């Protein structure tokens, strides 16, 4: 809430989960998946108790996905279906979540880096015409990940459902010539976990069953510190084998599919991706930077997003970096490794740091006028209102 009483809202508008809330909030108000589901008839399922609308959204769709044909509007940070994306924004601003009046509120949004421009122009075109938000801002996911951590200098690693991007900053000075994107995230893992479960005979071909495997991933799958030690456990023992019960009562068993699926963040060739993993990419992004800045990046590696919540990811990441520092910088001097100072900020609240940072920048700039972008400015200028941010559009 600003001086004028207008509520200041922060919506992440992610690719797999929406994180909406108000400024100054230390948690988010609602966290729900970004899917839209239309009704469908299937012979296996029989339900006539709960009313199924023609357009279900969010948590009331994923819960009832058995009777639905869900579809994600966003993919890899980019918006595909606008007519399904507006039905999501409505649910986000309606009596079921944040029962606000858009005409008397300020909004803060996020876009990932090196995305197209028409995806940013078309969002702002929508917030001022359809919802007629009073003040709008489109922030950078990296800079917000630092505000929550309380920093001015740190290489960011933000992995979500569709996008995995890396953005270095040094004392608040953006270095977009070092920004890198890996094309791997929680959705490219969820597909690889289906392709692995297919060897056991479990088939998850439908659109609803895609979420069911996400829950199987969020619960069981993890990252191996030393992948050789994990393979001995799967060959010599059978303790990794867990069990998951599905909504239809059928039980399954998941073993070495727990560390093999998310290893595609470090060995990405397993999903037909040419390149290097998140560690050898983060080390090569730093080695591109100016030589004086490198020392403070290793000390301030910041994680974020929900694809960094695999058990063992930061420890695995610290390991692979020191192997590369030893191999390429120190040329094999183990004795000097003790002096190598590296700290990977892995706070367990790293699941929502892009939102928390948006609560922080909003509360700091809620009561300023040169910051936001007004409806009046969009009526006069149009999409050229974005020049306030430095985004060259006409």
């Amino acid at each position: 809430m600003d001086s004028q009483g207008r509520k200041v809202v922060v919506c992440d508008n992610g690719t797999g989960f929406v994180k909406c809330g108000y400024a100054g909030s230390n948690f988010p108000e609602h966290i729900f998946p970004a899917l839209v589901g239309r009704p469908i008839i299937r012979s296996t399922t029989k339900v006539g108790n709960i009313e199924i609308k023609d357009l279900m959204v969010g948590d009331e769709a994923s819960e009832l996905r058995s009777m639905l044909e869900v579809n994600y509007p966003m993919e890899n940070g980019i918006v595909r279906n606008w007519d399904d994306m507006k039905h999501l924004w409505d649910y986000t601003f309606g009596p079921e979540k944040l029962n606000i009046d858009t005409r008397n509120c300020k909004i803060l949004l996020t876009e990932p880096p090196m995305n197209p421009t028409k995806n940013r122009e078309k969002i702002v075109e929508v917030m001022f015409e359809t919802y007629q938000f009073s003040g709008v801002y489109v922030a950078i996911q990296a800079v917000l990940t630092l505000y929550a951590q309380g920093l001015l200098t740190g290489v960011v690693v933000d992995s979500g459902d569709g996008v995995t991007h890396i953005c270095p900053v040094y004392e608040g000075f953006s270095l977009p010539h070092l920004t890198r994107r890996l094309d791997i995230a929680g959705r490219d893992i969820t597909r690889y976990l289906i392709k692995l479960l297919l060897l056991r005979g479990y088939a998850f071909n439908h659109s609803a069953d895609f979420e069911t495997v996400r829950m199987i991933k969020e619960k069981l799958c993890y990252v191996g510190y030393n992948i050789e030690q994990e393979q001995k456990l799967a060959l010599e023992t059978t303790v990794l084998v867990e069990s998951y019960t599905l909504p239809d009562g059928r039980i399954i068993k998941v073993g070495g599919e727990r560390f093999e699926a998310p290893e595609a963040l470090f060995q990405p060739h397993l999903i037909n991706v040419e390149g290097v993993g998140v560690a050898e990419l983060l080390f090569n992004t730093i080695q591109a930077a100016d030589i004086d800045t490198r020392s403070e990046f290793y000390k301030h590696i910041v994680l974020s997003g929900g694809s960094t919540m695999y058990p063992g990811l930061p420890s695995r990441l610290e390991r692979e970096l020191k192997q590369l520092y030893l191999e390429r910088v120190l040329k094999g001097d183990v004795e000097k490794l003790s002096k190598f100072k590296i700290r990977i900020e892995d706070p367990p609240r790293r699941k929502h740091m892009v939102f928390l940072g948006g609560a922080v920048l909003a509360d700091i700039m809620k009561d300023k006028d040169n910051f936001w972008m007004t409806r009046q400015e969009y009526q006069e200028k149009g999409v050229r209102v974005l020049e306030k941010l430095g985004v060259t559009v006409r």
Binding site: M114, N115, P116, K118, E274
Partner: protein
């Protein structure tokens, strides 16, 4: 045949052929592709590695590795395959019979020259060899002894002034900014339209786009507003799968990095100031001779509008009295090889070689004395 051989060994291409000839016999990219899958179809010429145009034909299933980067050789094992592919397969000659003339950019590490000369003898058993500067050969083909050359290739860009066959090494300047740095920048701005190119093979596609649609703007800020108003520069390109793209503003923003490297984050100065600052380091007497005999070389200088933008910027810095004349022949993509066939065809050059016996007694360090 006792004709000498010539090999450029640029960062991106390998230009080869015989001495005395007017154009090279073999031109292929300096890449070595290794497959990224497991070949289960047996008896199908499935080799462990591919080289040259045989890789670009199979780029879909390969990881293309440029063994050279900014002029330096990073992988010597792969570079033997390049030379081995040059002699035995392309030129179809043994190297022990003929000599070879190699090239190299200035201000490179000495270990790069030491290794080449070591490889031509101990591996290929050449009778002799020689290592020339790339810019100096461009002037031989130009038919001059006075002029400043600006060779801009795939990885390196360097200036070399000469005055009556007397090179001024104190004025030589190098700039690690070239086509491969532009190709990568083009892939970063093409995301703005919605076109994603990440794979190495996709990097070669973007190379073909860069060398077909990108031009230099005589006034960057003026054409910036042209595209914002109209749709005249919007050219299109057909990908091999049949898809189609369109690029406007991105045609002249890519080569402008040569004149504004701040887009790439580099603190360095543009080529228009580099070649000027080099001239200012020469003697006050000979500056006028170099303002006139200003030559360009390398494939990167094949953009349309590059000669007019250099002439414009150089005039703006230098005094109005001096007349700026740019020289841009229509074969400047092979000038460095053309001069090599010239320089090896001379009687005076037959003593500048480094014979087998001379390397046997002095070792590979003789290259620093013999080859300037």
């Amino acid at each position: 045949d006792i004709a000498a051989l010539v090999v450029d060994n640029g960062s991106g291409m390998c230009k080869a052929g015989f001495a005395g000839d007017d154009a090279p016999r073999a031109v292929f990219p300096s890449i070595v592709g290794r497959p990224r899958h497991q070949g289960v179809m047996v008896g199908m010429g499935q080799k462990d590695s591919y080289v040259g145009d045989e890789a670009q034909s199979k780029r879909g299933i390969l990881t293309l590795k440029y063994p050279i980067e900014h002029g330096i050789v990073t992988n010597w094992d792969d570079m033997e395959k390049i030379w081995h592919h040059t002699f035995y397969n392309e030129l179809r000659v043994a190297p022990e019979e003929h000599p070879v003339l190699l090239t190299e950019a200035p201000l490179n590490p000495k270990a790069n020259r030491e290794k080449m000369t070591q490889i031509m003898f101990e591996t290929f058993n050449t009778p002799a060899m020689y290592v020339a500067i790339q810019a100096v050969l461009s002037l031989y083909a130009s038919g001059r002894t006075t002029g400043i050359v600006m060779d801009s290739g795939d990885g390196v860009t360097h200036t070399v002034p000469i005055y009556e066959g007397y090179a001024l090494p104190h004025a030589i300047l190098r700039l690690d900014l070239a086509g491969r740095d532009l190709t990568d920048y083009l892939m970063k701005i093409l995301t703005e339209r919605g076109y994603s190119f990440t794979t190495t093979a996709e990097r070669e596609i973007v190379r073909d786009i860069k060398e077909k649609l990108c031009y230099v703007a005589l006034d960057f800020e003026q054409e910036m507003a042209t595209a914002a108003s109209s749709s005249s520069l919007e050219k299109s390109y057909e990908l091999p799968d049949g898809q189609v793209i369109t690029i406007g503003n991105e045609r002249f923003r890519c080569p402008e990095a040569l004149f504004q490297p701040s887009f790439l984050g580099m603190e360095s100065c543009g080529i228009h100031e580099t070649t000027f600052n080099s001239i200012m380091k020469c003697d006050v007497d000979i500056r006028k001779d170099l303002y006139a005999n200003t030559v360009l070389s390398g494939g990167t200088t094949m953009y349309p509008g590059i000669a007019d933008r250099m002439q414009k910027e150089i005039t703006a810095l230098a005094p109005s009295t001096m007349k700026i004349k740019i020289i841009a022949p229509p074969e400047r993509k092979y000038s460095v090889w053309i001069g090599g066939s010239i320089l090896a065809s001379l009687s005076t050059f037959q003593q500048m070689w480094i014979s087998k016996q001379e390397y046997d007694e002095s070792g590979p360090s003789i290259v620093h004395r013999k080859c300037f």
